Amino acid sequence: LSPMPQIAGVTYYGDIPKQPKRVVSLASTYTGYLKKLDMNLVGVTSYDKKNPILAKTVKKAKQVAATDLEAITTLKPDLIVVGSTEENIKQLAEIAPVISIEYRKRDYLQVLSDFGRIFNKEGKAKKWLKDWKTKTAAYEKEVKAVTGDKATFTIMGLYEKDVYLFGKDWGRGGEIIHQAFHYDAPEKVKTEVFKQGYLSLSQEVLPDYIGDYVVIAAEDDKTGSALYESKLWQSIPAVKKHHVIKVNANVFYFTDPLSLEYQLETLREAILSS
């Protein structure tokens, strides 16, 4: 059995195997952490299949939702990984031992070392973390050399007609921009977004939450269109000065090592280019 260490946000159901061989991930937040720890994923989520970075490493995995109990059963998992919002752990636990993670209890870096502790891969985890911290601190200097040290960044995501602001730990590049590069945010973003993590926003207050730079995540090119054509949007200094970094949500939603590596290089190149 796994030693099953007690970790904030981690709940074990059943007897976690010490070396899982057939993992079903039902939480795209964590799939790429498992991948990075060279675990064999035999089921993954829609989001994971849509992630152009991660998808390449899980081609053999079946796409499964939590609602596909029969499909999951057929995969013969020895471990199922879920987010704590999953409402039917009860039936999942009847199929295989389940690990449930409550989002945000541990940070984007701790999550990896935590899995290291659970699954006997603290070596592989600690190597990645050390190199990550090195590379990021270097890149931070490079990017701040261009923008200045006090440049403000806002993280933004578009979905359908919805507009969200994000903080430092709700994906969309906020972990890299706000944590790894230690960029400040506009005042209203800090006081209204950072603690909660995200904020649904009226389009017409947007200028008040954007300073020097803005990172905007979206799943396709069309979703922006009409906002990007608006006078209000076009009146925003950061937009006028081409300080808008448009990124692909299908990878930028996540904070796993694989997604992050790509995000890190993408964001660095974008800022240097400005």
Ligand SMILES: O=C1CCC(=O)N(O)CCCCCNC(=O)CCC(=O)N(O)CCCCCN1
């Ligand atoms: O649990 C839900 C909604 C359940 C649902 O029906 N989904 O579709 C969510 C799928 C998320 C896709 C991966 N994105 C990230 O990990 C980035 C952060 C984020 O945005 N989250 O949602 C983190 C999950 C926990 C936050 C609370 N919200």
Ligand SMILES: O=C1CCC(=O)N(O)CCCCCNC(=O)CCC(=O)N(O)CCCCCN1
């Ligand atoms: O909206 C949902 C489910 C989808 C979700 O959460 N995803 O991450 C999926 C991809 C983005 C979908 C567009 N929706 C947003 O961007 C909303 C901000 C967000 O994502 N939260 O997690 C805030 C927490 C609570 C929100 C209520 N639950």
Ligand SMILES: [Fe+3]
């Ligand atoms: Fe979300």
